[PDB]
Amino acid sequence: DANSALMELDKGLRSGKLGEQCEAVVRFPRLFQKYPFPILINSAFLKLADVFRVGNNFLRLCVLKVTQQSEKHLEKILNVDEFVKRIFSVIHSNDPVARAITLRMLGSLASIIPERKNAHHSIRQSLDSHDNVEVEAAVFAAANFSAQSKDFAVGICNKISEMIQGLATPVDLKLKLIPILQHMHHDAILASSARQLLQQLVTSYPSTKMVIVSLHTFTLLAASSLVDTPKQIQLLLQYLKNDPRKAVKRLAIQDLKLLANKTPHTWSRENIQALCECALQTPYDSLKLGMLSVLSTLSGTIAIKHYFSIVSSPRSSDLVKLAQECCYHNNRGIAAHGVRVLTNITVSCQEKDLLALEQDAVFGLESLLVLCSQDDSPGAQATLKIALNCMVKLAKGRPHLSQSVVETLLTQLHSAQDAARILMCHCLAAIAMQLPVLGDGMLGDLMELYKVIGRSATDKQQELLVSLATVIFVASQKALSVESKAVIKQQLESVSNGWTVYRIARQASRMGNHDMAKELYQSLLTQVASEHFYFWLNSLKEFSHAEQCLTGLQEENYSSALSCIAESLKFYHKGIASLTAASTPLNPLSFQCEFVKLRIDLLQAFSQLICTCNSLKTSPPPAIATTQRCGRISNQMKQSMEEFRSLASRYGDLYQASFDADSATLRNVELQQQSCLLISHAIEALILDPESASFQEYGSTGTAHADSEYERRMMSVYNHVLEEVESLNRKYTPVSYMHTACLCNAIIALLKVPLSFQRYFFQKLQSTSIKLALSPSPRNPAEPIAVQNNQQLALKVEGVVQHGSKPGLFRKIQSVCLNVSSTLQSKIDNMTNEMEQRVEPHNDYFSTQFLLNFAILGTHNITVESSVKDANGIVWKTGPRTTIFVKSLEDPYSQQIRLQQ
């Protein structure tokens, strides 16, 4: 049912009515989106071409619209020459509107035909014509060809130079033709000639209209040709300084904004001096906001480090004082830009005679905060965003200010409206997440604030409870008191949405407070109106129950270890039964089931290990026969090697097969895998061959990023276990009981730090899938493709990538590794044709050519695997795992020859 849509819509195309043909033409883009493979694309584009050739000039506009929309599918066209000839057969017509439409189609088609000479001749001929629609379409197509072709660029450089300063072709047409000079960056002397022509134009037509158009053109030429961008930044400083007009100044602002966003390393010191000095003596306020917005975007990059470079007192520098009087300005936006600049100076380079500004910086934030808290307007909300981002960055860069930072924030958490409680709770959440030592310093104060929310408004209430209980969970780095649980619970019994309690429960499951997760999951379990959502909530409840059982541990007590581990396994198994029941074909929950299954396997590896440590106290030294490994305990810990190493491999396999998670979920998977490697190394350093260890951890054990509290406690446990392993290296007997005690304490230390269900367990932001439509003949089901067993099978695998939303949010596909293998299904098994190829997609397409050698006699099983390679370099093992069946026939002449031989 792939070409059937093509025959249906082209049956629509063979009508004699304009309406049905137009309907089919405008229905083509949906069909393009549904099947993107180039057979259908090429066929439908040729049909669009020979519908375009004969038409009543309104079908032509519709096909132009479809070509404009479906630009990313244009490179998939195979029979390019017939397509372009059918389109080009309308230039020689005498209807000027049809000609203009066809030049617009050529301009749309520019990507696939950069160096077609007759197209350039048609553009040049129609460009100096007298019909206005033809002229405008010619300028459009000249702009679109000039971005790709170079000989067209130089010839049209001469032509457009002549027609701009030809003193005919009135000012509207000149405004239309200056972007032709914008697209004109291909060669050095071409760029220089365009630069001279633009300078002559801007000094020759000193208007409001032409100066704006010419300056935007001139800066796009500068940002395209990176050979004299500082000259244009310089020229923009004289245009922003010495020009009385206002709109020219506004373009100078947006121009310097674009140039600072693009190439900030070219900004020289005197350029920043000129920008700051022009920002001082301006009488207006919107212009002030614009220049200091440009300086704020310039302050977030390495331009400041070039500005504050050794070989004057930086207190006397223009930028810092300008930041001061615009941080203490009346308008809110200019204050936000100034406090961004001051925060960025503080976070950047650490010269001594800047440190006093630190004090100014922090006071600035709270001053701005008490201006923008009590306003309730979207501009004030954006000012809140900017201020709180500056608060986070300021506390991040200089931690010794940070404590003062957080306490000031709590003051404005006492008196502000319901839209200001949120995002301040978020700033507190971020600061107390990465830097935890301050979080407890809130504790109880949030309690009374939370009490006030018992009698607050209703419109923004639910999000506000979500934010407050989230920052409560973040701040409670050690645990939560029973009274804290009681007050949170009674408040959300007082009023709740039902989805708010779900968000609170999943926040608690994220942080590690699994008892309140239990209680809210009970509340959800009584609730809710579907099958698999009920099973999902039951599974989450059981996981919270097992994790409270894991929190109920005591150090140096192995009996409680076995008991609580058994309770955790039984609650996890009720939970994994619920998860298996909750799985749906529409939403095939795969990360959750694998994560829970490997968690179960980790705790059972721990259980077998702890009872194996108990086996030395539960068996003989060996036997009467043994009198360099003696006893069954050696074989048992070798099995522990096998289980833990396989478990680490399975954690790695779960890491590689996701590709759609965030940094935190991946880092948590890394924590679990590192726990498996930790226990494996700890055992193979104590009992199984101490002799060839000889390492004593010759790597760094400090100075970590510590992006979460769970990460920090994991790393502390890791370092403590490695310290115990280094100390107890080669002093004692190979079996020992300090060795078993070391394993016991290691297992207790790993199970004390609870767990963290991360973001990918609950919500999925990025969804990427691959198609891989195999076409040797695609078969049907059990029917195999017949091969003649004297030639190879040209597989011809072709693929396309499907993105759920926001194309690539976290990681971007750079190249894709297709792997193919065979298997003799008759019963190594045909490993002789394992093949690998790297693909770089153009827009979404994958096109490779695979030859498979089927040689022996039988039915073979082709499997195709995908492997995404990202921009950094990590390979990711996703893919549909496509399998196809082949039967190997023989030539009867060859069969008779083999029988005779």
């Binding site: 009515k17 304009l18 309406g19 049905e20 137009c22 309907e23 405008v26 229905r27 949906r30 309104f58 519709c62 379990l525 009584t526 809710v528 109106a529 579907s530 099958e531 009920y534 099973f535 039951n538 058994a566 396994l569 039984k570 198994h573 009720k574 039964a577 619920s578 998860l579 298996t580 029941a581 799985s583 749906t584 074909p585 095939p588 929950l589 795969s590 179960i600 059972q604």
Partner: protein, 449 residues
């Protein structure tokens, strides 16, 4: 040796209570000895007293039968068939004692139905549907009687309750062999008669747009128009699994709907009396009063039974939004066909009157209304103007000419403005931009310059 291995591992499970779930785990992930896993699950259920929520047995069988993996589904299914072929009376089999445990929780779930026990019984009905579906486990008389006890229960008020009664309706419609005695047939007649006179209360209080009443109307229309495949599709969509059902049981069920209870007049009246779905869109799933009224428009029964449609179509058009549902375009098409083409030669006058002038005017004065509604009404106006010029041989012999929409209102309609708006947002308005351009090209060369 299968029974000796189950006996050995069962004694081991009794010996170590904690790792019985582990023995279940290996049974799952090597697909060996299903009866062993079920028996130890029953033993661990005997061990706990944690029966506050759903049973672990229910969750486990739901995971094995209705799961992402297929080979465990086939393995548990052939376990069910092997338990079915053990015809002689022997209580030592694991499967029948699992049936008694499910019977015990049937006893416990019975009353009408309680508020806390509303999703437990729906999950149980889905489980038993899977057992008689993919697994194919023919029940006994007492089990079928208690199934009819459970499905003919009274859900209190909940959206979980309307999910329950929809699942109970498809539970009945999937397996009509489950009822065998006349007394149970009187029981299901009483239950259906209750399910008629109650729909408005659950519809209003639950607030869902996917209630049971449109499903009742759908099955009435599909039996009335003799479309059994639509019934099969509806029950397979609502239950959540694909099960093949013989048409003979559905033919008996067709008789009990068409002869009594759902006569065609009361079906038409009740389908008129349904409310409209505010903020319709296409993101909501379900089966909907719009598909109900579209099916009742396709098989001509409104004007054949003297009931109006007009304000419903008006309100449903006026309460539409972004991405458009894939049913409104054929709904407007068959609405126009109902305006123009008469139903039968007995009443050539019999037709639907079109939308009044003032209402369309109040739409196009605005923005109070939605742009999807405006585009839909523009499509209605243009298609009515086009089709009124087309079916004119029947129009002249019909003597109740509904007439064009004057010219004052047609002057006060921005056609090019809404067509530009349709082109601007063509990505979510799919199926309407093409029709608007078709109508504009074939009827208005005013603006195709």
């Amino acid at each position: 040796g299968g029974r000796r291995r189950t006996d050995a591992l069962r004694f081991l499970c009794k010996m170590n209570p904690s790792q019985a779930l582990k023995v279940r785990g290996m049974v799952v992930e090597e697909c060996h000895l299903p009866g062993l896993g079920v028996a130890l699950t029953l033993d661990h259920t005997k061990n706990e007293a944690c029966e506050d929520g759903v049973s672990d047995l229910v969750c486990f069988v739901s995971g094995l039968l209705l799961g992402t993996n297929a080979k465990v589904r086939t393995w548990f299914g052939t376990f069910i068939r092997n338990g079915q072929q053990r015809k002689r009376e022997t209580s030592s089999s694991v499967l029948w004692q699992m049936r008694r445990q499910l019977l015990l929780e049937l006893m416990g779930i019975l009353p009408g139905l309680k508020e806390e026990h509303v999703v437990k019984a729906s999950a149980l009905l889905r489980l038993y549907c899977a057992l008689m579906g993919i697994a194919g486990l023919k029940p006994t008389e007492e089990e079928a009687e208690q199934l009819l006890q459970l499905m003919t229960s009274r859900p209190p008020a909940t959206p979980a309750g309307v999910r329950f009664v929809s699942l109970s309706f498809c539970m009945l419609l999937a397996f009509s062999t489950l009822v065998s005695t006349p007394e149970q047939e009187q029981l299901m007649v009483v239950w259906l008669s209750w399910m008629i006179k109650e729909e408005a209360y659950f519809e209003s209080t639950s607030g869902v747009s996917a209630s049971f009443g449109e499903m009742l109307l759908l099955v009435a229309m599909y039996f009335h128009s003799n479309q059994l495949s639509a019934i099969i599709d509806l029950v397979c969509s609502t239950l959540g699994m694909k099960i093949v059902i013989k048409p003979s049981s559905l033919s008996r069920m067709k008789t009990i709907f068409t002869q009594e209870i759902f006569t065609e007049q009361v079906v038409t009246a009740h389908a008129v009396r349904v409310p409209v779905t505010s903020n319709l869109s296409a993101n909501i799933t379900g089966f909907l009063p719009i598909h109900c009224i579209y099916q009742l428009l396709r098989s001509r029964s409104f004007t054949k039974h003297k009931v109006s449609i007009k304000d419903w179509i008006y309100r449903q058009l006026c309460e539409t939004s972004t991405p458009l549902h894939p049913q409104l375009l054929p709904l407007i098409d068959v609405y126009i066909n109902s305006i123009l083409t008469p139903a039968s030669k007995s009443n050539p006058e019999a037709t639907n009157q079109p939308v009044t002038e003032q209402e369309i005017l109040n739409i196009f004065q605005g923005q109070r209304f939605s742009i999807t509604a405006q585009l839909l009404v523009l499509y209605y106006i243009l298609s009515y103007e086009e089709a009124l010029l087309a079916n004119t041989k029947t129009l002249a012999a019909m003597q109740r000419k509904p007439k064009s929409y004057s010219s004052s209102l047609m002057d006060q309609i921005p056609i090019k403005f809404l067509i530009r708006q349709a082109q601007g947002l063509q990505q979510e308005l799919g199926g309407l931009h093409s029709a608007l351009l078709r109508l504009l090209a074939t009827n208005y060369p005013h603006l195709c310059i």
